Design an enzyme around this catalytic site. Structure first.
Site, short mmCIF file in Angstrom:
data_model
loop_
_atom_site.label_atom_id
_atom_site.label_comp_id
_atom_site.label_asym_id
_atom_site.label_seq_id
_atom_site.Cartn_x
_atom_site.Cartn_y
_atom_site.Cartn_z
N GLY A 22 1.40 2.08 8.76
CA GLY A 22 1.60 1.45 7.36
C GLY A 22 0.19 1.59 6.63
O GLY A 22 -0.85 1.85 7.28
N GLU A 58 -14.50 -10.83 31.18
CA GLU A 58 -14.96 -10.30 32.44
C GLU A 58 -14.03 -8.96 32.87
O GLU A 58 -14.72 -7.94 33.17
CB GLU A 58 -14.79 -11.13 33.47
CG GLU A 58 -15.61 -11.16 34.68
CD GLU A 58 -15.38 -12.25 35.78
OE1 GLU A 58 -16.26 -13.22 35.45
OE2 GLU A 58 -14.76 -12.24 36.87
N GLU A 91 2.42 8.96 8.36
CA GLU A 91 1.62 8.03 9.49
C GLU A 91 0.71 8.62 10.38
O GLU A 91 -0.23 7.90 10.68
CB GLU A 91 2.57 7.31 10.31
CG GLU A 91 3.57 6.44 9.41
CD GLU A 91 4.42 5.55 10.26
OE1 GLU A 91 4.06 5.11 11.50
OE2 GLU A 91 5.76 5.11 9.82
N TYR A 101 13.25 -4.05 15.56
CA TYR A 101 11.80 -4.71 15.63
C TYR A 101 11.90 -6.18 16.26
O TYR A 101 10.73 -6.09 17.10
CB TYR A 101 11.38 -5.01 14.22
CG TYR A 101 11.00 -3.65 13.58
CD1 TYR A 101 10.38 -2.83 14.12
CD2 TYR A 101 11.07 -3.51 12.11
CE1 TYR A 101 9.87 -1.45 13.57
CE2 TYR A 101 10.75 -2.47 11.68
CZ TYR A 101 10.03 -1.24 12.24
OH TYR A 101 9.44 -0.16 11.67
N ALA A 159 0.57 -1.14 -0.04
CA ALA A 159 -0.19 -0.17 -0.03
C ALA A 159 0.86 1.17 -0.09
O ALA A 159 0.26 2.33 0.27
CB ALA A 159 -1.14 0.09 1.19
N1 LIG Z 1 6.51 -2.79 17.09
C1 LIG Z 1 6.56 -3.02 15.73
N2 LIG Z 1 6.45 -2.06 15.00
C2 LIG Z 1 6.42 -2.47 13.46
C3 LIG Z 1 6.98 -3.58 13.06
N3 LIG Z 1 7.23 -3.38 11.62
C4 LIG Z 1 6.61 -1.98 11.28
N4 LIG Z 1 6.42 -1.55 12.56
C5 LIG Z 1 5.68 0.11 12.61
O1 LIG Z 1 4.66 -0.07 11.69
C6 LIG Z 1 4.56 1.20 10.91
C7 LIG Z 1 4.92 0.99 9.42
O2 LIG Z 1 3.89 0.10 9.06
P1 LIG Z 1 4.00 -1.34 8.43
O3 LIG Z 1 3.26 -2.48 9.14
O4 LIG Z 1 5.46 -1.68 8.01
O5 LIG Z 1 3.45 -1.12 6.85
P2 LIG Z 1 2.38 -2.46 6.44
O6 LIG Z 1 1.45 -2.50 7.27
O7 LIG Z 1 3.11 -3.33 5.72
O8 LIG Z 1 1.59 -1.13 5.12
P3 LIG Z 1 2.38 -1.05 3.74
O9 LIG Z 1 3.81 -1.66 3.89
O10 LIG Z 1 2.34 0.59 3.43
O11 LIG Z 1 1.57 -1.62 2.57
C8 LIG Z 1 5.62 2.14 11.41
O12 LIG Z 1 5.46 2.75 12.47
C9 LIG Z 1 6.76 1.12 12.05
O13 LIG Z 1 7.57 1.68 13.07
C10 LIG Z 1 7.44 -4.36 13.86
O14 LIG Z 1 7.65 -5.42 13.30
N5 LIG Z 1 7.27 -4.23 15.20
#
Ligand SMILES: Nc1nc2c(ncn2[C@@H]2O[C@H](COP(=O)(O)OP(=O)(O)OP(=O)(O)O)[C@@H](O)[C@H]2O)c(=O)[nH]1
Ligand SMILES: COc1cc2cc(c1Cl)N(C)C(=O)C[C@H](OC(=O)c1ccc(CCN=[N+]=[N-])cc1)[C@]1(C)O[C@H]1[C@H](C)[C@@H]1C[C@@](O)(NC(=O)O1)[C@H](OC)/C=C/C=C(\C)C2
Ligand SMILES: Nc1nc2c(ncn2[C@@H]2O[C@H](COP(=O)(O)OP(=O)(O)O)[C@@H](O)[C@H]2O)c(=O)[nH]1
Ligand SMILES: [Ca+2]
Ligand SMILES: [Mg+2]
Ligand SMILES: [Mg+2]
Lengths: 69, 426, 440
Positions: free
Chosen positions: C143, C254, C183, C224, C99
């Site tokens: 994301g 609960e 974001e 991560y 996305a």
């Molecule tokens: N805690 C944690 N946060 C993560 C991780 N991977 C990505 N993030 C956070 O997620 C956000 C980015 O979204 P992602 O989940 O990587 O993106 P996506 O859901 O794959 O969406 P697109 O790649 O744009 O299609 C950022 O704030 C990152 O810091 C993870 O493995 N652990």
């Protein structure tokens, strides 16, 4: 009392079905409205590009006209 | 696989394009024969972004070579990696552009554009999921500027939902004696503002100044300038070619770098810049933000940063990189727009470029880029008020009104950069 | 009966899902091939761990989970990783193009092409359930998939499953590990769209977890992997009531009764203790009182905010390990006489306690020390709205100039969706002020 008990559970069913129904309708409207909007943006982009092709045809025509003069 | 299709047009575009493929082939362990002989699996994990895989475990650049004269492309084929390109991807004419944007865009270029599209279509059809395109060209000549911008528009018509990226070499009187380069550059900018998603401004003015002032080269050759280009192009594509989290594809990069569609002209930077015959994380960070290290002749302290991408390469402390990136933003907060929070993103790649233990590559969307466009506009209006050599362009079918429209649109771009430079949150 | 289906969306949701299911397997004695030697009923059963694991005739214990991502590279690591034999291939769903950090592409342009397949795969999990309780949805706010596709999925799940409960674990963005300038946009859009479709949402502030790893685990630059190991321990504490049986065990539903006073006020603050390295835990036993006291240290919260500057509407203590009520009650009495715990006037002040006797587990190679007892506090405090305020302020700064909005409009969205989403967040912030005002 039995009549009230029936009306309560019928109310719970009606509210749950209305929530499902409205969620389904709102999403159908959003996806259709979004589909039309994106298609309109792509159509505008290609329309501008085609006008550039039309302008290029006019430029090559202008060169051939001055060569015949 | 998220493939990129590479296109190089004209003399400059084919020259800097060949150096780009040489540099990244060495980085990915590809020899001139197309065989892999590296020692790290990170070299091959995202190899498909730029290379097609063929019989014999051979990797073929997804590259298309275009020019209206056979000269530069013959020397490309005789280059070190000349045998690695696909022979059918050589599309060359015979007439030439003669430094005429009109011939490249409307006349000679239009007669060859369809044969180039057949090769673009062939490479795109075999892509698992095409990202988009990157084009290398100059704006001061005829083929790369005129036909290059023509190719962008025609490709845009067939791939309107794909990202269009260019490496555009800006002309400077310090490098080329041709006096109509402001014409060809302004006409090209008129197209790039409308039809590209992101453009790296490779300014020959800055490249000469770096070679002369910093590298102490009295007589900079095109090879000297292209060494800076290849190192820059390697750095700004690192996130596309190696496993990583930040700006890993052309569209995520554009979404992070382009807050308004027309303002997509980037100021590249590189550190270190040292002469052959003459480094800590703080020093590496400070240098990449220095105007002397910018590949565009613009002082960032004369404007404000909308967005910034920073790429560190080599083995180093990520904690130290984070502290230094925070430090340079905090100490220079005036030069970052406050209405785009957290507008600087940082990536770290373990693999350093050839010959360096540590390096940094800077990608800035700064309102100070207007200094580059003002310089071109000043050299344009000095020629256009005398109508110098206009008959060469009008003789191809153009008229002065198209010159006026290109000048006004570029002047509008400057006004827009100034608008957001002056904007405030409160 | 009482099955729970987990849905992991986008990179953050998938990678957190990796850490959670690995931890579950260790807690239950499930091998990477799915075999569980302690399970004597082959091919099925109604044990507590069956809420999260189905069973095949060949003795494999299979997560009731779907992994979804619009690009394949993250889930491909699951397909070739250590626990690849744990999942049926159809449980791992991927597209070819993500996305691009754009809510509009996750919810519309790209997400619409895979949403029907995802729902079909979820339906196949639901059909294997004899008494499905609800869904757990893991995703990032920031994301494009985590925001846009999750909200699309949540909307479709309300239609296909009615008011079956849907809980979220939502990753709240932090600049130390964030990857997109937009974001704040994606966060406000997904929070607005999902608000009416979620019964309970546990936000996880990446900056809070980042700080805990740096401060408590002495990790110089957390990855991560570091973050997700800690997150999985909190998730495990919250779901342990569903996966284990015990006399003092209290079901999550609960706690939910106490945690949600109004439908929109459904965002509990999680606090977890102890987070300590092996070097510090050696010859250092942390008692029930010490880990309970740590729950009221704001540095241990999963979301950065100051509860001492807000009002409580619920306090739940979820213990696991060597813990008995006598020590809990004594610890709570000490805290009530020494902490800034002010409730709203329309809420009872008693703390709700649950205890699971199964001790906490750690993943080999991790940084967390293995401890005899742990606790997760779930509180409903008005202070969590401070997380909304920070996000809404970043939204306002960019949206006033319409910065980056063209990326969303180009994918079919309208400016009216931005303002509608922002107004909903304004009303939510106002709701949190109103519930904290004393009664007339
Ligand atoms: N805690 C944690 N946060 C993560 C991780 N991977 C990505 N993030 C956070 O997620 C956000 C980015 O979204 P992602 O989940 O990587 O993106 P996506 O859901 O794959 O969406 P697109 O790649 O744009 O299609 C950022 O704030 C990152 O810091 C993870 O493995 N652990
Ligand atoms: C005192 O006035 C000057 C006289 C001259 C050059 C300059 C100046 Cl000031 N200068 C230094 C300039 O920079 C001006 C540009 O010159 C060139 O581009 C150029 C390119 C190659 C060569 C090699 C020798 N060949 N010769 N003669 C020379 C000049 C020029 C006219 O604006 C471009 C045209 C748009 C372009 C020219 C062209 O190349 N094609 C085409 O269709 O339009 C054409 O055709 C070959 C060549 C024309 C060459 C001249 C008219 C000589
Ligand atoms: N940096 C760099 N600039 C070049 C190179 N070759 C040409 N140029 C620049 O490109 C402009 C000339 O355009 P050119 O590529 O020769 O025109 P074309 O071949 O018809 O497309 C001049 O401003 C040159 O300074 C090169 O190898 N490196
Ligand atoms: Ca069993
Ligand atoms: Mg030349
Ligand atoms: Mg992703």
């Amino acid at each position: 009392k039995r009549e009230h008990e029936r009306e309560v559970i019928q109310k719970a069913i009606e509210e749950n079905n209305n929530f499902i129904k409205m969620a389904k309708e709102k999403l159908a409207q959003k996806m259709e409205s979004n589909k039309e909007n994106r298609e309109a943006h792509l159509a505008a982009m290609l329309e501008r590009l085609q006008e550039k092709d039309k302008h290029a045809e006019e430029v090559r025509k202008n060169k051939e006209l001055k060569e015949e003069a | 696989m998220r493939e990129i299709v590479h296109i190089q047009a004209g003399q400059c575009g084919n020259q800097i394009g060949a150096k780009f493929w040489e540099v990244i082939s060495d980085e990915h362990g590809i020899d001139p024969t197309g065989s892999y002989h590296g020692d790290s699996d990170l070299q091959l994990e995202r190899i498909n972004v730029y290379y097609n895989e063929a019989t014999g475990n051979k990797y073929v650049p997804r590259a298309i070579l275009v020019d209206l004269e056979p000269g530069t492309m013959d020397s490309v084929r005789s280059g070190p990696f000349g045998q690695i390109f696909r022979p059918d991807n050589f599309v060359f004419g015979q007439s030439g552009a003669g430094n005429n944007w009109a011939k490249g865009h409307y006349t000679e270029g239009a007669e060859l554009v369809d044969s180039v599209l057949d090769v673009v279509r062939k490479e795109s059809e075999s892509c698992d999921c095409l990202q988009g395109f990157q084009l290398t060209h100059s704006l001061g000549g005829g083929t790369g500027s005129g036909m290059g911008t023509l190719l962008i528009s025609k490709i845009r018509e067939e791939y309107p939902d794909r990202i269009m990226n260019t490496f555009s070499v800006m002309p400077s009187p310090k490098v080329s004696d041709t006096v109509v380069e402001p014409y060809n550059a302004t006409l090209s900018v008129h197209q790039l503002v409308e039809n590209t998603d992101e453009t790296y401004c490779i300014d020959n003015e800055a490249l000469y100044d770096i070679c002369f002032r910093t590298l102490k080269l009295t007589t900079p050759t095109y090879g000297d300038l292209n060494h800076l280009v290849s190192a820059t192009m390697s750095g700004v594509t690192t996130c596309l070619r190696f496993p990583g989290q930040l700006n890993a594809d052309l569209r995520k990069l554009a979404v992070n770098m382009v807050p308004f569609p027309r303002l997509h002209f980037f100021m590249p930077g590189f550190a270190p810049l040292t002469s052959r015959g003459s480094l800590t994380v703080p020093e590496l960070t400070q240098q990449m933000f220095d105007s002397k290290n910018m590949m565009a002749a613009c002082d960032p302290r004369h404007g404000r940063y909308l967005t910034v991408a920073a790429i560190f390469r080599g083995r180093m402390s990520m904690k130290e990189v984070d502290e230094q990136m925070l430090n340079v933003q905090n100490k220079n907060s005036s030069y970052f727009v406050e209405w785009i929070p957290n507008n600087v993103k940082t990536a770290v790649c373990d693999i350093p470029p050839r010959g360096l233990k540590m390096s940094a590559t800077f990608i800035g969307n700064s309102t100070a880029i207007q200094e580059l466009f003002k310089r071109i506009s000043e050299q344009f209006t000095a020629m256009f008020r005398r109508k110098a050599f206009l008959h060469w362009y009008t003789g191809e079918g153009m008229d002065e009104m198209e010159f006026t429209e290109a000048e006004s649109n570029m002047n509008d771009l400057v006004s827009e950069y100034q608008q957001y430079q002056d904007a405030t949150a409160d | 009966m009482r099955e729970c289906i987990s849905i992991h969306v986008g990179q953050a949701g998938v990678q957190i899902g990796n850490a959670c299911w690995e931890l579950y397997c260790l807690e239950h004695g499930i091998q990477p091939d799915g075999q569980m030697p302690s399970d004597k009923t082959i091919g099925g059963g109604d044990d507590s761990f069956n809420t999260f694991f189905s069973e095949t005739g060949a003795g494999k214990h299979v997560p009731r989970a779907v992994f979804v991502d619009l690009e394949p590279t993250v889930i491909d690591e699951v397909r070739t990783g250590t626990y690849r034999q744990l999942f049926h291939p159809e449980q791992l769903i991927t597209g070819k193009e993500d996305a691009a950090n754009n809510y509009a592409r996750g919810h519309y342009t790209i997400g619409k092409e895979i949403i029907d397949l995802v729902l079909d795969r979820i339906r196949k999990l639901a059909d294997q359930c004899t008494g499905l309780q609800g869904f757990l949805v893991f995703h990032s706010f920031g994301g494009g998939t985590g925001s846009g596709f999750t909200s699309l999925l949540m909307e479709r799940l309300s239609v296909d499953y009615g008011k079956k409960s849907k809980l979220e674990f939502s990753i709240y963005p932090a600049p130390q590990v964030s990857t997109a300038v937009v974001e704040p946009y994606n966060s406000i859009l997904t929070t607005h769209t999902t608000l009416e479709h979620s019964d309970c949402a546990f936000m996880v502030d990446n900056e809070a977890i980042y700080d805990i790893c740096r401060r408590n685990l002495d990790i110089e630059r957390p990855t991560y992997t570091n973050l997700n190991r800690l997150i999985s321990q909190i998730v495990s504490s919250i779901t342990a009531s569903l996966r284990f049986d015990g006399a003092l065990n209290v079901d999550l539903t609960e706690f939910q009764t106490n945690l949600v006073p109004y439908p929109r006020i459904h965002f509990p603050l999680a606090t977890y203790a102890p987070v300590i390295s092996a070097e510090k835990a050696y010859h250092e036993q942390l008692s029930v009182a010490e880990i309970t006291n740590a729950c009221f240290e704001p540095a241990n919260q999963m979301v950065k905010c100051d509860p001492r500057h807000g009002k409580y509407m619920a306090c739940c203590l979820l213990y696991r390990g060597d813990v008995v009520p006598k020590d809990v009650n004594a610890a709570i009495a000490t805290i009530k006489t020494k902490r800034s715990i002010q409730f709203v006037d329309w809420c009872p002040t008693g703390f709700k306690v649950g205890i699971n006797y199964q001790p906490p587990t750690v993943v080999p190679g991790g940084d967390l020390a293995k401890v005899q007892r742990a606790v997760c506090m779930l509180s409903n405090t008005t202070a969590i709205a401070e997380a909304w305020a920070r996000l809404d302020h970043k939204f306002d700064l960019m949206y006033a100039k319409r910065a980056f909005v063209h990326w969303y409009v180009g994918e079919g969205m309208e400016e009216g969706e931005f303002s509608e989403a922002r107004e909903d967040m304004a009303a939510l912030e106002k709701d949190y002020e109103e519930v904290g005002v004393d009664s007339v």
